[PDB]
C-alpha cells in the first residue's frame, strides 16, 4: 500500500544509511537461501586433505578404489573442474 | 457506597468460569489416570 | 528502568544457576556464577542512594575474587589430570580453595561479614534474591562434588557459621540483617551435612527458600525494615500476625512446625555417622536462633506495641497482597512436618 511506500521513500532520503544496513542485513541472509552454489561451500571444503587419508586393508569386500588410485572408482571429484 | 469505585465491583466472570473449568479437568484427569493405573497395576504384575 | 532491560536481566539471573545446573565442565559451571553476579549489580542500584553504591562494591570485590579463586582450581585441575571436572583424585588444597571461595560466595566462618551488610542498605526485592536463588548456583557447583571435600574444615565452617550466624542475630534490630544472619545459621545445616547424604541439604534449601520469601513478601507489604516499624502491625494488618508467628517459630525449628525437620533429620545422619560431640553444639546454639525470634515475636503479636496516630489513615486504603505466593508457601511450611516421609 501507499502507507508503507511513503515511509520507504521518506525514511530513505532522511536516513539513507541504515537502509543499506537493514537491507544488507536481511539481504545477506536471503541470498544463501536461494543460491545453487551454496552446496559447494562444504563439498570443496570437505574434499581438502589437510590430513593424510589413512588406508584400509583388503578383506575381500568394499568394492571401492584399488591400491593404485588411478581407477575412476571412489570420489574422483571432477565436478570441481568445469565448476 | 464506595466512592472510590473498587476494582472488584462485578465478578471477574472471565476467570471464575475459567478456573472451575480447570479444576474439573484437574479432577477428571486425576481419576481416569488413577483407574487406568489400578487397571494397569493388575495386568502389569499378575493381578 | 525499561521492560526491555528488565526481562533481559531477570533472564540472566535465571541463566546463571541453570547454566551452572545444566552443564558438566567447571567452566560453564563458572560463568553461571557471573550471570548470577552481573545481573545483581543493576538492581542493587536503582534508588542510587549511597547505601546501594557501597553494597555493590562491597559485594562485587567479595564476589569476584571468589570467582577467580574458583577459576584457579579448574586450571590447576586442567593441569593436574587434564580435563574440566573434579574427577576423584584431585589434591585437597585445590578444593580447599574451591570450598574457600564458595564460602565467600555465601558467607560462613569469617566470610559472612559482608552478606548482611549488603542485605542492609537495599530494597527487599533484590534482597530476596541474594538468599534464595543466587544461593543455588554456588551449591550447583557443589552437589557435583558429593564426596571428597575435606570433611575436617567443612565442619569448621558450619559451627563458626552457626555461632556467628546466631550471635550476630541477637544484637540487630533491622529485619534485613536478621533474615540475613539466619541465612548463615541455616547454612551450616545446609553445609555440615553436605558429604553425609546431600539430598538432605537440597531440602533445607527448598525449605529455607519457603521460609524467607513469605517473610520478605510480608515486609514488602508494608516496607518495614525494623522491629519497631513492624511491631505496629496490629494496627496495620492484625491478620498477618498468625503466619509471621508460625513462620518464625517454624524457621527456628520447633517440632510441630516443619523447620524442625531439617534440623532433626540432619542430626539423624550425623549421629548415625559417629559425631556425637559436634552436632550437639549446633542444635544447642540453634536455640539461640530462637531468642531473637522469640524476642521478635514479643514485639509482633504477643503484646501490641504502641503505634502512630498517623496510621489511622492507613486503615482506609484497601491493601493488596499477592496470591499463590505467601499463603501457598506459608502453609507448605508451618503445617507440613507430618509429610516428612514424602519430603524425604
Amino acid at each position: 500500500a501507499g502507507r508503507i511506500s511513503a515511509f520507504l521513500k521518506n525514511a530513505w532520503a532522511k536516513e539513507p544509511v541504515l537502509v543499506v544496513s537493514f537491507s544488507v542485513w536481511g539481504l545477506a541472509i536471503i541470498m544463501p537461501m536461494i543460491s545453487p552454489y551454496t552446496k559447494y561451500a562444504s563439498m570443496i571444503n570437505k574434499a581438502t586433505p589437510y590430513n593424510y587419508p589413512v588406508p584400509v586393508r583388503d578383506d575381500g569386500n568394499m568394492p571401492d578404489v584399488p591400491s593404485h588410485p588411478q581407477d575412476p572408482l571412489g570420489p574422483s571429484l571432477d565436478w570441481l573442474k568445469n565448476l | 457506597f464506595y466512592v472510590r469505585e473498587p476494582v472488584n465491583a462485578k465478578p471477574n466472570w472471565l476467570a471464575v468460569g475459567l478456573s472451575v473449568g480447570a479444576s474439573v479437568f484437574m479432577w477428571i484427569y486425576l481419576i481416569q489416570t488413577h483407574n487406568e493405573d489400578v487397571l494397569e497395576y493388575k495386568r502389569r504384575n499378575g493381578l | 528502568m525499561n521492560p526491555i532491560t528488565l526481562a533481559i536481566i531477570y533472564f540472566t539471573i535465571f541463566l546463571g544457576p541453570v547454566i551452572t545446573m545444566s552443564s558438566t565442565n567447571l567452566m560453564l559451571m563458572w560463568v553461571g556464577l557471573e550471570f548470577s553476579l552481573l545481573a545483581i549489580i543493576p538492581m542493587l542500584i536503582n534508588k542510587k542512594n549511597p547505601r546501594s553504591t557501597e553494597a555493590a562494591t562491597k559485594y562485587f570485590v567479595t564476589q569476584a575474587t571468589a570467582s577467580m579463586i574458583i577459576l584457579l582450581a579448574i586450571v590447576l585441575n586442567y593441569k593436574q589430570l587434564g580435563t574440566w571436572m573434579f574427577q576423584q583424585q584431585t589434591n585437597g588444597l585445590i578444593l580447599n580453595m574451591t570450598l574457600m571461595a564458595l564460602s565467600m560466595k555465601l558467607g560462613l566462618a569469617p566470610f559472612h561479614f559482608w552478606l548482611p551488610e549488603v542485605t542492609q542498605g537495599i530494597p527487599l526485592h533484590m534482597g530476596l534474591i541474594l538468599l534464595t536463588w543466587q544461593k543455588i548456583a554456588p551449591l550447583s557447583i557443589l552437589i557435583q562434588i558429593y564426596p571428597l571435600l575435606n570433611s575436617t574444615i567443612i565442619l569448621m565452617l558450619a559451627i563458626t557459621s552457626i555461632f556467628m550466624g546466631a550471635w550476630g542475630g541477637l544484637n540487630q534490630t533491622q529485619m534485613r540483617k536478621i533474615m540475613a544472619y539466619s541465612s548463615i545459621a541455616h547454612m551450616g545445616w545446609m553445609l555440615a551435612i553436605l558429604p553425609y547424604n546431600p539430598s538432605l541439604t537440597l531440602l533445607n534449601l527448598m525449605i529455607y527458600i519457603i521460609l524467607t520469601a513469605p517473610m520478605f513478601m510480608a515486609l514488602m507489604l508494608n516496607n518495614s525494615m525494623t522491629i519497631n516499624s513492624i511491631s505496629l502491625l496490629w494496627n496495620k494488618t492484625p491478620a498477618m500476625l498468625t503466619m509471621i508467628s508460625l513462620m518464625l517459630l517454624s524457621l527456628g525449628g520447633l517440632p510441630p512446625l516443619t523447620g524442625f525437620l531439617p534440623k532433626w533429620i540432619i542430626i539423624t545422619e550425623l549421629m548415625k555417622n559417629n559425631c556425637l560431640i559436634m552436632a550437639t553444639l549446633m542444635a544447642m546454639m540453634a536455640l539461640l536462633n530462637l531468642f531473637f525470634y522469640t524476642r521478635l515475636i514479643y514485639s509482633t503479636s504477643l503484646t501490641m506495641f504502641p503505634t502512630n496516630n498517623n496510621s489511622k489513615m492507613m486503615t482506609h486504603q484497601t491493601k493488596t497482597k499477592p496470591n499463590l505466593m505467601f499463603s501457598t508457601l506459608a502453609i507448605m511450611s508451618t503445617m507440613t512436618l507430618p509429610l516428612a516421609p514424602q519430603l524425604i
Partner: protein, 62 residues
C-alpha cells in the same frame, strides 16, 4: 470386642514393628559397605563417558 482381638492385634504390630528395626540396621550397614567398596548401584559417582571420543585416525601414534 475383646482381648482375643487385642492380644492378637498387638502381635500384629510387633511383626510389623520389630521387622523395621532389622531393616534399618541392615539398610545402614548396606549403606556403609556400598560406599567403601562401591559395588552396588548406590554411590556410583560419575565418570566421563566413552562416547565422546573419536576412535578415528588423527596422526601417527596418538
Amino acid at each position: 470386642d475383646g482381648p482375643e482381638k487385642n492380644y492378637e492385634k498387638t502381635l500384629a504390630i510387633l511383626q510389623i514393628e520389630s521387622e523395621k528395626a532389622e531393616l534399618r540396621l541392615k539398610e545402614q550397614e548396606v549403606r556403609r559397605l556400598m560406599r567403601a567398596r562401591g559395588d552396588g548401584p548406590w554411590y556410583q559417582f560419575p565418570t566421563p563417558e566413552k562416547e565422546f571420543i573419536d576412535h578415528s585416525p588423527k596422526a601417527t601414534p596418538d
